[PDB]
């Protein structure tokens, strides 16, 4: 085997007609190049190389990044002079900063709920009794996570942040009742604790069962929407169950042993005066029973209207600190043209904006390779030293690339979920369901592109693939071959070998077996004429050029063939226009497609399909969850009117939730759905706190209205305490402004409005509901 250019150049080669023994260097430039010149890399405008690391199925991103960075540091030592390693695109830093921000907001929620409970009890002890149940319940939730095969992601972490304000509900109830008994009756801590238990043991269990049962159906939803619900379900449900176990097991012991005798600023008289004014207002309300039920019917109407009309989405986009830029030049584009386009784009954001590093891959691109395709992963500088946001940057690049270089460069944001889609927005597949053929599908496709150019809720709904192109098909005149006397196999050989770049065998290059590729030199395969200058041996002994026996003809054909669910199709990307949700765009796309030739169908793929499933199962999750809560309620209070009075409070929580979302300008995404169910649960909690004690007082002989107003007054303090607790615990979600703050904004706005409503609108309506529903029977 030869190992050096010298041995390869001196390879003998018998000369066919004359006899001279020539060497290989006579007919061929021998040199060392790369196996295939498919891809190139531009790191910060300079030529370089790269190695894209695709995560292992279900591996850890942070751990994988830690490993790869360590291996790079290890390999740095053996780098000859001149080589430098770099990671010009890394995503796990964002995973590390997201999970850290979520744990930080969890701790902020803990601190704020501790401050709320302290402000409402004024002794570190009284407030430490419940504040020890949150960490223990959280740790039990962690053990259950491990036993079930779960992980620590931003979903379950967000579930714990939501739970912070729900875990401590039971313990707050117990401590408040014990404090209240020691204040009114002055009983010793032990027997006062026993009386508080004999009083609210069943309220606690009821609150618990309701909160844990409202979160169960959501986890049963199918699709990624379910895989998202399941995190919040497992987290919050197990958290609430352990919170109840602790409220019944640990907090009684604490309240019995470490509660000091009541001996011991302005809050006291103001809060009581506030309670009295509230009681008088409640009596004034109960007065006008029918009018408040009319106001409730009106609020339910508005709520239904908002939940039916407000635009829907799936997941909020986030400024992950980087974006992609896909350059799709027409067919017939050479790597030089793509280098020009990429150089333009690279120089367009080189020293003008504040980006960390911009790496372009020439010849490679999601949804197709080729000389006329590149993908550039520009990584934003940072989040603490930023100016324009990711979405404000992409827009600049798009507008500063659509008018200068020929192609289709479209800077796009990273997706919401890691492995769902490559870019943010919707992804549709235009299918050919009636065998219309490729040309018909492509005409339908460009029509659809023509219709999507004048829509306002659309921006650039481009084609995510390769474009049609001119081919040069050669027709071989076999009769001319038989008359010229030339073998056909020789013409076939000459053509195939003239273009192929065939590989032969290996050779030992510096200890490694590397390939030996042969190929017609560059300057002899560029234009068509070169091909038509190849010569074959005829019959009369003279050479005949290919141009005399072959006739070219130029066709127009698609250069990439896409298929979906069996039928030929065309991937149609698209990103919704400003002030337009993804749901509206999806619905608009359906209509447009409905305006297309017959036989052309459409399918949603990835984020779009998942979003469609979310929207198509949000009614059954609210229909089944509400029914579960109603049935549990009826089981718990052996009646059909009490659960109706408890259910009548749900529209008020949804009311506030919708109000908050509309005011803030968010959408009806899955996080809002998570809050929707959380607010159903918390609303039911606030209602039960009143309805249970009112039923008990009515069974004690008291009059319905008097029992109702007395129970409302006596439970105003636990209700407001727990309510303000959960609301101030979620405030960190609403006010968050760092990186990955939009997920927190979407997940907290809904529950914030819903809690504000299901507390300010509950302590006035639940008595009305109770009295009305009991009088009507």
């Amino acid at each position: 085997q030869l190992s050096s250019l010298e041995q390869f150049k001196n390879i003998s080669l018998k000369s066919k007609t004359n006899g001279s023994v020539i060497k290989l260097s006579d007919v061929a430039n021998v040199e060392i190049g790369s196996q295939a010149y498919n891809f190139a890399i531009l790191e910060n405008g300079k030529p370089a190389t790269a190695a894209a690391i695709q995560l292992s199925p279900g591996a850890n991103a942070v751990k994988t990044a830690e490993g790869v960075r360590a291996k790079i540091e290890e390999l740095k030592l053996n780098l000859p002079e001149g080589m430098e390693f770099s990671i010009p695109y890394d995503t796990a830093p964002f995973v590390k900063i997201s999970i850290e921000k979520v744990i930080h907001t969890l701790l902020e929620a803990m601190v704020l709920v501790f401050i709320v409970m302290y402000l409402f009890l004024h002794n570190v002890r009284y407030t430490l009794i419940p504040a020890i149940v949150a960490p223990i319940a959280l740790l039990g939730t962690f053990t259950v996570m491990l036993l079930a095969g779960f992980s620590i992601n931003v979903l379950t972490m967000f579930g714990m942040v939501l739970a912070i304000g729900i875990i401590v509900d039971d313990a707050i109830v117990v401590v408040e009742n014990v404090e209240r008994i020691m204040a009114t009756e002055g009983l010793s801590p032990k027997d006062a604790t026993s009386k508080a238990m004999k009083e609210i043991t069943s309220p606690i269990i009821g609150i618990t069962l309701v909160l844990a049962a409202v979160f169960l159906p959501m986890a049963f939803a199918s699709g990624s929407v379910g895989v998202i619900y399941k995190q919040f379900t497992l987290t919050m449900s197990v958290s609430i169950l352990f919170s109840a176990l602790l409220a019944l097991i640990l907090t009684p012991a604490l309240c019995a042993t470490i509660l000091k005798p009541i001996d011991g600023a302005w809050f006291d008289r103001s809060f009581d005066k506030v309670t009295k004014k509230y009681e008088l207002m409640l009596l004034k309300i109960i007065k006008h029973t029918v009018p408040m039920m009319v106001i409730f019917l009106v609020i339910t109407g508005i709520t239904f209207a908002g939940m039916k009309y407000w635009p829907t989405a799936f997941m909020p986009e986030e400024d992950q600190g980087w974006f992609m830029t896909s350059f799709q030049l027409p067919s017939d584009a050479t790597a030089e043209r793509t280098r020009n386009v990429v150089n333009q784009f690279e120089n367009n954001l080189k020293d003008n904006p504040d980006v960390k590093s911009n790496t372009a891959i020439l010849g490679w691109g999601f949804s197709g390779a080729g000389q006329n395709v590149a993908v550039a992963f520009t990584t934003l500088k940072d989040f603490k030293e930023r100016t324009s946001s990711a979405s404000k940057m992409t827009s600049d690049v798009n507008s500063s690339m659509a008018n200068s270089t020929e192609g289709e460069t479209m800077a796009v944001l990273p997706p919401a979920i890691d492995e769902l889609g490559t870019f943010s927005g919707f992804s549709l597949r235009l299918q050919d369901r009636a065998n219309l053929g490729m040309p018909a599908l492509l005409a339908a496709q460009d029509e659809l592109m023509a219709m999507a150019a004048k829509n306002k809720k659309f921006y650039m709904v481009w084609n995510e693939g390769l474009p049609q192109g001119d081919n040069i098909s050669l027709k071989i005149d076999r009769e001319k071959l038989s008359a010229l006397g030339v073998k056909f196999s020789d013409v076939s050989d000459i053509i195939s070998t003239s273009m192929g770049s065939m590989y032969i065998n290996d050779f030992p290059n510096q200890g490694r077996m590397q390939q030996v590729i042969v190929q017609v030199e560059a300057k002899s395969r560029m234009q068509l004429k070169d091909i038509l200058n190849l010569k074959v041996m005829g019959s009369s002994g003279q050479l005949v050029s290919l141009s005399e026996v072959v006739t070219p003809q130029w066709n127009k054909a698609p250069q990439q063939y896409n298929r979906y669910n069996g039928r030929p199709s065309l991937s149609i990307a698209g990103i919704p226009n400003f002030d337009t949700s993804s749901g509206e765009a999806m619905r608009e796309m359906e209509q447009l497609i409905a305006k297309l030739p017959k036989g052309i169908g459409y399918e949603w793929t990835g984020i779009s399909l998942q979003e469609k499933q979310s929207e198509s199962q949000m009614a059954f999750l609210l229909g089944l969850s509400m029914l579960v809560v109603f049935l549990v309620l009826a089981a718990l209070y052996e009646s059909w009117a009490i659960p109706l009075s408890v259910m009548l409070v749900v529209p008020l929580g949804i009311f506030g939730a919708i109000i908050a979302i509309m005011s803030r300008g968010l959408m009806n995404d899955v996080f809002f759905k998570i809050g929707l169910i959380t607010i159903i649960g918390l609303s039911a909690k606030n209602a039960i706190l009143i309805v249970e004690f009112a039923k008990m007082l009515k069974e004690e002989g008291m009059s319905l209205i008097e029992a109702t107003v007395a129970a409302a007054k006596l439970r105003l303090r636990p209700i407001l305490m727990t309510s303000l607790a959960f609301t101030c615990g979620v405030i960190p979600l609403v006010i968050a402004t760092g990186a990955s703050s939009e997920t927190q904004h979407a997940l907290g706005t809904g529950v914030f409005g819903g809690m504000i409503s299901a507390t300010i609108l509950a302590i006035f309506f639940v008595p009305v509901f109770f009295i009305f529903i009991l009088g009507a029977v």
């Binding site: 370089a48 790269a50 995560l55 279900g58 001149g82 895989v227 992963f377 669910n565």
Partner: protein, 144 residues
């Protein structure tokens, strides 16, 4: 599925349709796609229901294609059908540059393929390493 040189029409009518004829009726198949490009390469992505065991589903796909590995063109067969539980986006993009220009891009890609890609793949948690740069090779540019 690789089939060198051949344009996308050939990969589409001789290879992809065959494999797609067996991909149906696989367990928990959510949706399926297949893209053939000009590089003489087809990527057939069978996307399964969320939460489905990716291992057993990968096994199912292997079984289905086994029933269609005897009809594909000879090149396709003797080039292998790499079936892997895949991903969409790159976790990270390790690269090697030469600021002093002591090494041309070909030398950087060679060094990366010969001494980096293998040891990057030999990291726990690395599922695939796609090298955007080709190993060195003795090229014979003939002159017809």
């Amino acid at each position: 599925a690789t089939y060198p040189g051949a344009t996308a029409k050939t990969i589409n009518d001789s290879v992809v349709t065959l494999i797609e004829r067996e991909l149906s009726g696989v367990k928990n198949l959510l949706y399926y796609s297949a893209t053939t490009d000009t590089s003489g390469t087809a990527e057939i992505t069978a996307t399964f229901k969320p939460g489905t065991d990716v291992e057993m589903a990968q096994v199912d796909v292997q079984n289905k294609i086994k029933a269609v590995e005897a009809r594909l063109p000879q090149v396709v067969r003797q080039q292998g059908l790499q079936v892997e539980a895949s991903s969409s986006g790159f976790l990270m993009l390790v690269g090697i540059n030469s600021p002093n220009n002591q090494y041309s891009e070909v030398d950087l890609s060679d060094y990366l393929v010969r001494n980096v890609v293998e040891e990057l793949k030999r990291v726990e948690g690395v599922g695939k390493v796609q090298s955007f740069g080709a190993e060195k090779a003795m090229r014979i540019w003939v002159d017809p």
